[PDB]
Each structure stands twice: as structure tokens, then as C-alpha cells.
Amino acid sequence: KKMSIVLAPFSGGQPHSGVELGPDYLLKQGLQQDMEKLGWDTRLERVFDGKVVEARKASDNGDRIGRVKRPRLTAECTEKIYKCVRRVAEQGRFPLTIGGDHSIALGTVAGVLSVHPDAGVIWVDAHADINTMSGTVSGNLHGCPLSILLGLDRENIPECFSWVPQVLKPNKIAYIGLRAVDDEEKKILHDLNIAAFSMHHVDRYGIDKVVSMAIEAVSPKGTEPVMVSYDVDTIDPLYVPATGTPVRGGLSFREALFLCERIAECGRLVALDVVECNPLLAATESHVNDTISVGCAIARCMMGETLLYT
Template sequence: MTHTNKFITSKDISIVGAPFSGGQPQGGVEHGPLRLVEFGLNKQLEELGYKVDYEANHDLESLKPAHDPVFQNLKNPKFVSAVTKKLAGQIEERAKQNKFVLTLGGDHSVALATVSGIFAAYPDACLIWVDAHADINTPEATESGNIHGCPLSFLTGLSTSHPDFAWVKPVLKTGRLAYIGLRDVDDEEKKILKDNNIKALSMHHVDKWGIGKCVDICLDHINPNRDLPIHLSFDVDALDPSVAPSTGTPVRGGLSFREGHYICESLAETGLLVAVDIMEVNPALESEESVFSTVQVGCSLARCCFGESLL
């Protein structure tokens, strides 16, 4: 069952590979996109009636500078900036060609590219961020220095002082951002979320209200008339490690298999979804069996975003 999309008239999906691990310390996450494609994701989406093109972007490593010291607490700032700037241009171009953009990560620093690119094409879009982590640390506040924990601070304009990310425009208003599945949030981030009145639903809220009501609450806040484009950025670590074990920063007590899929299904049903990121699948972590189940769930989440449903 496919739903009429209110913004995209074509049946074209542009899969953008973002095989990049520079936003965090663990190698392997750069192999996530290829594993999802090798598992047959393109064919699965074609079977749902879409025309799919895939850009692997295997050459991102060539953008790595010879010298990239820690600056303003951030690790690999020049590398992360160069890669995300390149991908942002590509994603913007595909979105403006009236294609649905599905970005496969890579670590979540790649959201600097996806949100920049999609919001350049759809300036009034809103963002649903499904993640165990809020990823809204400022360079001053980050304890780890890993940029995958910081993209939303740049995209919302809360961070503006880092010269390597001067190209990132504050395209995302805090009133257009909502979170589902949070369970590992730094103190400084908690303050940012409260001070900016950002709709942030943790696993406590999912337990209290159920996933259906949580999705409705987020949409009521960021898209009250259900007339704005929706960008979904889904970090597989939002899922419980029993569901998606092969990810860099797993935290117990996450979304169940069905809760994760419900989010994708219900957003597909709105007919407003224009872009999806599936992030942080890391085939180098855990056993081959764990990798298989994580890749399988990544593909399955993507299919739900394109209208695959239980009945």
C-alpha cells in the first residue's frame, strides 16, 4: 500500500550513500550503507513500485586533510566539514529534482549534510529525530569531542562560532524539531532542550503514552496542520540493542522492533515524508548474526517509510 505524497509527484528514490565514520571514534560505520544495499534494499524498494538510483560516494576518504587537529573541542572538524558539505550539495540537488532522498549512514554527523540539503529544497520542512541521543551538544559543551553528537547545534544556529562549519546555515527552527526515543542525554543538552522549548520525548514518554500518541504529540507540535514536509532522521541506536545490536553507542531500554516500525509507517501514512536518514549501522561491531539482524532492521525501516505495511 503506497500513500500519495503531497510534495513528491515522482516515484523516484535517490539513495545517497554516506559511508563516513569521521564524526566518532569507531571504525566500521562507513560500511553500513554498502551492507544495506548488498542486502537488497534497492530491489526491495523497486518491488514497492519505485524507481531507485544509488550513489555510493565511495570516494569520501579522499577529502581527508593531511592535518586536522582538534579545534574548539571538536575532533576531525575539517574532514567532517568537507564530507558533509559535499553530500549536502548532492542531497539538495536530488531533492530539487523531485526525488525522495534516502540517505544511508555513516555516523550521525552526516545529518549536517542531510538536513542542510533537504531544508535548502524544502525551507518549511520539519525534522523528526529518532535517537537514543539528542545530538545537540555545542562545541563548548561536548565531553567527547565527537561531532556526531553535535550536528543539531549547528543546524539550529545554537553553535555559530566554529570556522570549519561556517557553511552550515541555521535552517532548522527549534520549533520544527522533535525527538522520539531519547534515553542518554547530557546535562548541557537537557538544558538546551528546555531553554528552547524543543519537543523531546524520551523512552519514559513512550512507556507512559505508547508510541502512537508520541508520534501524534510530535507532529502536533512541529506540523500542527499536517501541511509541512517531514524529514525523518533515524539512528538505529534508538532501537533496543536486542533489536539493533551493531551500532556504535548502544543504550539499553530502547524502542522495540514494532515501535521503530510504527514511527516509519505512521509518517509514511501522512503523505508528507520527503527524506529519510538511516544512520549508525556499524557492521564491524558485534557478531555476524548481530550485524545481519541490524542490517535487516535498517532495510525494513526504510521499506516502511515507503508504504510497506502489515496489512
């Protein structure tokens, strides 16, 4: 029962700067003490200095490729997270990565699937994050990780991303909480028949059935390892206000945590990302604490914490 909290304070996948402060805020809330309190032998893994990275991030506007912003910086930092996560998993430890915007999942998923090729991926997000290099309108890379991981539109992916191992297939990723999918992304999920459970399915079937369907969708043999990449904006902005891309009509605080308890319950969780916490994008300090405490709650519930005896 060993764990490595991989710190990935990266904001190059999007415009707003506060998101790279996420790792520190979670740790200040006592994230590591909570994990140890849950019986986990933990250790921190700093992939790179967030200030040094943000210094180059906010200054280097020339880092572009058409509409795509900061492909170079993102490719570099993401490769490092990949190496770190890959290493943590090979050492037999559970990698719990804290972001940072969702572009870091390019390295986390790559790292985990490199050690666990049969691992399924449950993407908890209000967004599909699967825009292609030539299809993204905003050019914000935190909304394109899955396209790169799946090797879509390879005829347009930069050479600086050639390091990304092609280990994630479309039948091994399932979404939960979708409600702000771009038309290009819609076509993509449809053409590739990717298991996507929107807020419609949650409202229609209830969170429990959706989580079960999501686990089943990526676990054919019913024995595969499972990884969860958790974007906090999946949770309704009234619970998680401090985030870059909030979308109305998300999961309630209860569903957000119940989902974690159901996953932890299956016992095959092998990795977890908690991304998009941005303390700066908070109206009041109650917005900060409410968002950061949610990040730690997700971790605790994912990692074993229950309401009753266990």
C-alpha cells in the first residue's frame, strides 16, 4: 500500500494562471496527511517548479502552432509527467497526480497505460477534452489530451508530441458527466463509439447505474485495472466555483463523491488525477476552500474513505 502524490503544477494547457497552484493548495489542506491517515505510505514527487514554468508560460506567446497555444511547453512538461508517472507505477506505487490543467493527463494516462496496458480510463469531466490539433477552436491544449492520446488526426500532430506512446484505444475510455461537448467532439465520440455518459444519462439512470456502466465499458474481462482522471468542473459550479471552465448543471457534491466511493469499492483503481483546481478564480475565500476541500474529498473517497465501518 504505497502511494506517490505526483505534483504537476502546470497551466500551459489553458489561459488562466492560478491552476498551477492547485498541488500546493491541496497539500496545504492536508492531502498527504489524509492519505497516510487512510493507511497509505505516501511520498511526494515534484516533476518541475511551477513558478519557473509559469514564468515561461505567461511570457512566451510565440509558443504556438496555428490556433494551438503553447504546444512546445506543453509537450515538454507533459513528457516529464509521463516519465514521472511511468516511474511511480513501475516502482509499484499508486500515482495520485494533482494538477494543473487537464493537459497533464497526456502524461498521466500515458505513464499508467505504459505499465498497465489493459487499464481502463474513466474520464470524469463536463467536457470531452478530445478536440484535435486542427479542429480545436480555442487552441487550449487542456481540451485536446484525449485526441493526442488516441492518435487522432495524427496527420496534424506536431513532432514535439511524437514521444507520446500509443497505448490508449477508444474502447478503453469512458466519460462521466459530459455537458459541454463541441460539435467536432460529438462527431468524434460517435464515429469512434466511445462510451460517453452525459448529465442526461445521470439524470435518466441515476449516478449509480452510470458509474457501473462506465466501469463495465472499460473492463471487458471484469478484471482490468482502472484509472480515473477527474476534472473538478464536472461538479456543478455551485460546489466547485474556483475553476477555469465551469458549466451549469453538473454533478452535485454528493454524486461527485459517491462516484469515488463506488470506484474505490470495485478495488481495481490503479491511478487517479485530480485536475483543474484554480484558487485564483475564486470570488471569495469560501470559494477557494470549497473547491480545494472538494479536491481532497475526492482523493479521500477514491482512496478508501467511507461513511460507515469498513
